[PDB]
Design a binder for this molecule. Sequence first.
Ligand SMILES: [Cl-]
Ligand SMILES: [Cl-]
Ligand SMILES: [Ir+4]
Ligand SMILES: [Ir+4]
Ligand SMILES: [Ir+4]
Ligand SMILES: [Ir+4]
Length: 124
Amino acid sequence: KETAAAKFERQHMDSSTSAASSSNYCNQMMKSRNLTKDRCKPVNTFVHESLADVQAVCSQKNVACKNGQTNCYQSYSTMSITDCRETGSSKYPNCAYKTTQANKHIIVACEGNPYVPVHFDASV
Ligand SMILES: [Cl-]
Ligand SMILES: [Cl-]
Ligand SMILES: [Ir+4]
Ligand SMILES: [Ir+4]
Ligand SMILES: [Ir+4]
Ligand SMILES: [Ir+4]
């Protein structure tokens, strides 16, 4: 079935655009990446850097994950991200999102051989 690594890419990678400069971006992307299929995924971040750059974070600053696991990593540089957060009037299946562009350090959980991002933990 879909690998954890591929699912991270689907949920969190958007290297095509340098920043999400449409107010529509989250509405469209959350839909087209299948994050509105069974429910409205409430919060989700997209990263606008190369895959190589994001994968490389697994070799950067080791930090605790929010769930208490130890396999999280914080990017030494800031990265261009977009935060998508479901609006108060959003109702499945017409999931509605606020789009916020930022430049922040990402924190991702990594696992496997090869050791790759499998979860987006936080941005700081
Ligand atoms: Cl499959
Ligand atoms: Cl910084
Ligand atoms: Ir399969
Ligand atoms: Ir898209
Ligand atoms: Ir910093
Ligand atoms: Ir997770």
